[PDB]
Design a protein around this ligand. Structure first.
Ligand code: CMP
Ligand code: CMP
Lengths: 205, 202
């Protein structure tokens, strides 16, 4: 991504502590972000106003990019909340500067497009998971999927991931008590071992 | 500015209603653009149950989600089925990547369509959270009642739809839809009368 060098030269670096909200859904859109270090959580509210975790983005990912685009070329609003998952260092750049550099080098838009396409694939699969799987299947699939994503650690017996019961519940759309019951069953069946802030998922190497 | 500009390098093909244009799991090698018509986007579970993700219309590209992997080429992420007769422009990824190298305008159009699809599909995720199949079918029936192909009825609204079609909207089997409809009749929401259904209230 050497073609991003000229974009990062015009970025202001900001640090966000874990759990701090970077983007609030519904806000105006004038700024694009690039994750230098750390990771962020993408959240929406369901129709009950209850929060659901859509996914995570990691170093090398842009976020806040969808606000560049609108159907009639009118004002656009932030489509989700973005919250630091761990301590994050982000590069912030105005839409106005991004537009000038992307007009100078379309490779920047190829990188942005590649990331948006990946997110659309993942979110489309999430529709299927919510429709096709019951909660036990959704919890198991979430655990397996997280083992293949950044910040999973190779473990002698599988992969180790940084996640809590509450987070899994917000990902799969069930109660915090229900995820406890499901995870207990999955532990007894040999898929997972739950720890304080981490979980070990067996058979994922 | 590039409509005839891009079509100048495109093959034009026609697809009749219900034809599959893209099969999920195939190699991505071709970008499509709808000159006229509309398509349905569908996914499946590992048992062949189908679910509709959404629709694309005249002016929409599709088959684009493998286009930006210049690196490792992707598989088609969904089925694309012609909803009506479609006139489509087609261009290989190879030729498009060369033509678009200094074309930020065309990449911005592709990005804008992907952004629209990401927002809509994210809202669809939110609308599915905490909704079991019976609630999904009920909401679909109420939604179908507000569409222009519905008919008013003394007791409410009358719709024409098959269990197969309901199952594709909610992502379940035809048999499961049948069981749900029997439950919604016992609830008092609907009366199934062969090929049509009456939805009470609304
Ligand atoms: N389904 C999704 N997957 C990944 N990231 C998303 C998703 N929906 C929204 N976002 C991100 O959240 C951001 C919120 O602000 P924007 O709409 O500007 O840009 C959005 C994307 O960067
Ligand atoms: N969530 C979605 N919304 C709209 N269109 C989609 C969605 N998911 C996949 N598609 C389209 O279906 C196509 C299938 O092949 P591709 O993955 O190459 O590109 C895909 C997109 O054009």
């Amino acid at each position: 991504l050497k073609h991003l060098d000229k974009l990062l030269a015009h970025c202001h670096r900001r640090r966000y502590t874990a759990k701090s909200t970077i983007i609030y859904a519904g806000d105006r859109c004038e700024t694009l972000f690039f994750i230098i270090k750390g990771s962020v959580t993408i959240l929406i509210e369901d129709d009950d106003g209850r929060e659901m975790i859509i996914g995570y983005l990691n170093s090398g990912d842009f976020f806040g990019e969808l606000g560049l685009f609108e159907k009639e070329g009118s004002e656009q609003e932030r489509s989700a909340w973005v919250r630091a998952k761990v301590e994050c260092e982000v590069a912030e750049i105005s839409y106005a500067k991004f537009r000038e550099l992307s007009q100078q080098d379309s490779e920047i838009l190829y990188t942005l497009g590649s990331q948006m396409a990946d997110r659309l694939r993942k979110t489309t699969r999430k529709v299927g998971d919510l429709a096709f799987l019951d909660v036990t299947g959704r919890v198991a699939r979430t655990l397996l999927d997280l083992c293949q994503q950044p910040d999973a650690m190779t473990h002698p017996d599988g992969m180790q991931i940084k996640i809590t019961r509450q987070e899994i519940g917000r990902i799969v759309g069930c109660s915090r008590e229900m995820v406890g019951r499901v995870l207990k069953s999955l532990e007894e069946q040999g898929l997972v071992h739950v720890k304080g802030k981490t979980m070990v998922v067996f058979g994922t190497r």
